[PDB]
Amino acid sequence: VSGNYNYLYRLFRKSNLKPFERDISTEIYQYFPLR
């Protein structure tokens, strides 16, 4: 009801992922990359 903020997704990155690649870095991308 108050909102579940535990789940996050990446919005910003300098490139696209390769198959089964994982990127969990939090360095601010030209913005904080996760929302």
Partner: antibody
């Protein structure tokens, strides 16, 4: 000792061309990727191009479409072919092996002395 | 293309003073930054790799740290031999880029 020796500099006219070379010795040239970096009087360091150890993949900066990078691992020589040179390309051209944990993997950083190219 | 900047562009300090140079990236480059020192008439010399690792032979008075977009280069005590232009360079992705350069 490790050496990188640039040559082939000089003065050319606008729209002309010039081929530079860098002779390498003292290290396993054929296992490393190589970079070209230039510096004009009054300015900072500008990255120009990179070639992989096998002479396969090539990358370019402001110069893409005009400059070509190549190497010959049997002569330990790195080349840069510059076509359609402009006044803005006046600079001292260095060959280098830049320490890089992501792409070339080089653990050591080497530089040449640089050769001056003037366009006018 | 990742754009690099440095601040201040030029600084005035005496021998024995503490000197700090800030390098900032337009994009997050984690810890893949090199620091170079260039004296007039000479090729650039590498002092620091991977943001904070010192090169062999580099005096202990030199140091640096940082991650992401904000990096710092420090001289704990400026020596008369430390007058040079300092550059930061990113190698997170191609093309590689150098900063404007800071005059000490």
């Amino acid at each position: 000792e490790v050496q990188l020796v640039e040559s082939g500099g000089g003065v050319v006219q606008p729209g002309g061309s010039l081929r530079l070379s860098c002779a390498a010795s003292g290290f396993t040239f054929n296992s490393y990727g190589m970079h070209w970096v230039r510096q004009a009087p009054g300015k900072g360091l500008e990255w120009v191009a990179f070639i992989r150890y096998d002479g396969g993949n090539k990358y370019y900066a402001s110069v893409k479409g005009r400059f070509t990078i190549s190497r010959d691992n049997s002569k330990n020589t790195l080349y840069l072919q510059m076509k359609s040179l402009r006044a803005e390309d006046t600079a001292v051209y260095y060959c280098a092996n830049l320490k890089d944990s992501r792409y070339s993997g080089s653990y050591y950083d080497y530089w040449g002395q640089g050769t001056l190219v003037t366009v006018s | 293309v990742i754009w690099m900047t440095q601040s201040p562009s030029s600084l005035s300090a005496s021998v024995g003073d503490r000197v700090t140079i800030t390098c900032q990236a337009s994009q997050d480059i984690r810890f893949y930054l090199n620091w170079y020192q260039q004296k007039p008439g000479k090729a650039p010399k590498l002092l620091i790799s991977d943001a904070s690792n010192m090169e062999t032979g580099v005096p202990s008075r030199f140091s640096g740290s940082g991650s992401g977009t904000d990096f710092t280069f420090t001289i704990s005590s400026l020596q008369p031999e430390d007058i040079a232009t300092y550059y930061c360079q990113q190698y997170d992705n191609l093309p590689f880029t150098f900063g404007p350069g800071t005059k000490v």
